[PDB]
Amino acid sequence: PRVSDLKVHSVFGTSQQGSTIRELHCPSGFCLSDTDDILIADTNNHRVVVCGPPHPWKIGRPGTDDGQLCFPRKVIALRGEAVRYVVLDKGGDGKTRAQIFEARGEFVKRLNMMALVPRGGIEVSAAAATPNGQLLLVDTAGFVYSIDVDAPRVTFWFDASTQLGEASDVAMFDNLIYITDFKHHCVQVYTSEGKFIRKMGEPSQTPYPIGIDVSKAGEVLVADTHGNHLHVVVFSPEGQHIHSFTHNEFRLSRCVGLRIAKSGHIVTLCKHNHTLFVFKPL
Ligand SMILES: [Mg+2]
Ligand SMILES: [Mg+2]
Ligand SMILES: [Mg+2]
């Protein structure tokens, strides 16, 4: 039986940069919500866009005071009693800032933690939500953190730098943390105690990976645009290559992230053409 290519289902954006409520400008991250809504860190509009409703809406006003956003890069939905959103952006000191917003966009608090003001600085290369509602971060030093935003507290952290060249995305499923390695063309897999388990993929299968997610059955999906077409490569939970899907309808480059929706639709963000793309289930 034949297997289909990737096919576009829906979009947010116009394939060109803009400042209007239907457009993005150099967007740098996104997340799924508990509904069909998708939130986008719309970097050069200094806002988070919420798409999904007939009329999109936005979180934040531009700036560096509490509740304002400045070059937001990542947005993470934390599952719990109610959904809350972490936004990572640039603070007034030019360094990483983390803020918490509630489900309808109101500012809650700035996340102030020792882990966010280290001497060495913190540049976040990947962020996701853990299954239990924690914020999962990977930094450019190779440190991996799981953060309870309420205490706030680092509940666990470890050093991935022996194996990890450069993180581009991260996902957690069960007790395992999967990090796409943009430098080594593979996925690095760890336990939450920091034990390295295995790598998945290789240059011939997962070149320059930019996104990862894990399906409800534990299959690992890894996205790249090497050669200027989106590819989604599927691995079994043990790392066996299953199938590589290609998007042939049009060219894409400089994509960021990957998420599987509950319905199976596949989501990535194209920074190059300022557009979020949703594809039919694989
Ligand atoms: Mg304009
Ligand atoms: Mg225009
Ligand atoms: Mg992902």
Domain with residue 137: its CATH number is 2.120.10.30
Is residue 136 a part of any domain in this protein?
yes
93 is in an annotated binding site: no
Cα gap 70→87, rounded to integer Å: 10
Residues with CB under 5 A from ligand 3 (ion): 169, 213, 257-258
List the resolution, Å: 1.4
Is residue 2 a part of any domain in this protein?
no
Six token digits for residue 183? 């430098």
Domain coverage including residue 163? 8-279
Is residue 52 a part of any domain in this protein?
yes
**Number of domains present in the structure of the chain:** 1
Is residue 29 a part of any domain in this protein?
yes
* CB-based contact 79:85 (threshold 8 Å): no
Six token digits for residue 7? 């096919």
Nearest ligand (C-alpha, residue 180):
3
Is residue 256 a part of any domain in this protein?
yes
Is residue 179 a part of any domain in this protein?
yes
Question: Using what technique was this structure determined?
Answer: X-ray
212 is in an annotated binding site: yes
Is residue 219 a part of any domain in this protein?
yes
Is residue 63 a part of any domain in this protein?
yes
